[PDB]
C-alpha cells in the first residue's frame, strides 16, 4: 500500500511540485538548514530540488536605501540587454 507521504508516491503529488516551486522562489542560498524546517526538507525532499537563490525574484530586484528616481522594485532580468 502507498500513502501520500510514501517515498515512491511523492512525484505524483500536486503539492510536492507546488511546494518545491515555492521553495525555489523563496530561497537565497543552497544552504537549506538556515532557511527551511526539518519538516519542509523531509516532506518536500528539498535536497533534490535545485535550490540556490537563482529563481527567487528578490535576487534580481533593486532595493536601494535612498531612492531618488523611484526605481526600487525594478528587476534586472527585464532590462533590454538581457
Amino acid at each position: 500500500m502507498q500513502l501520500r507521504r510514501s517515498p515512491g508516491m511523492r512525484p505524483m503529488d500536486r503539492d510536492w511540485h507546488q511546494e518545491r516551486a515555492r521553495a525555489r522562489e523563496q530561497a537565497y542560498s543552497s544552504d537549506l538548514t538556515s532557511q527551511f524546517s526539518e519538516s519542509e526538507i523531509v516532506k518536500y525532499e528539498l535536497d533534490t530540488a535545485q535550490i540556490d537563490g537563482s529563481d527567487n525574484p528578490r535576487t534580481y530586484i533593486w532595493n536601494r536605501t535612498i531612492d531618488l528616481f523611484g526605481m526600487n522594485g525594478t528587476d534586472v532580468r527585464e532590462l533590454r540587454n538581457r
Partner: protein, 140 residues
Amino acid sequence: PDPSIDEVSKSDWDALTTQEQDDIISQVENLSSTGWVNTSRERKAEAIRSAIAERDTLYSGNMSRLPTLDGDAEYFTLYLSAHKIQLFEGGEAQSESGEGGSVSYSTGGGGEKDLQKTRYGRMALEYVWEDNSIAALRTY
C-alpha cells in the same frame, strides 16, 4: 578557555579534563568581584553543567527561522552559570550589614520568573529575546 563553554554539550562537560573544567570555572568566577570563593568547586561545576544542560534543552531551537539564542552563546552560558551559583549562595543580597558598616543595593522588585530574580539572570535574559514568543509558522 581551550574548549569554550559554548562549544561543549552536557556530555562534553563530563568528558573534559579537570583542567579544561577549571579554566571554564575560572572564567565564570570572573563574573563576581567576590569570585564566590566560599562556595566549593563541586557546586560551581554543578552550576555550569546545569547551565550547559539548560541552554541546550531550554534556550535552544528557533522562533520563526531566527535562533532563540540571539546573543553570544559564550557569555549567555557564563551569565546563566553565574545566576545558578548566586542562587546556590541563597539569592541576591538586597542588603548587607556587618560591624556597623552597612550597604543596600538597588535590586528591587525586579520580577517573579527565575531569570528576573538575579542581576546575572537579567543579563542572560537579554540574549534570549527576554523570553518573548516571536515564533511563527504557516501551512503548505
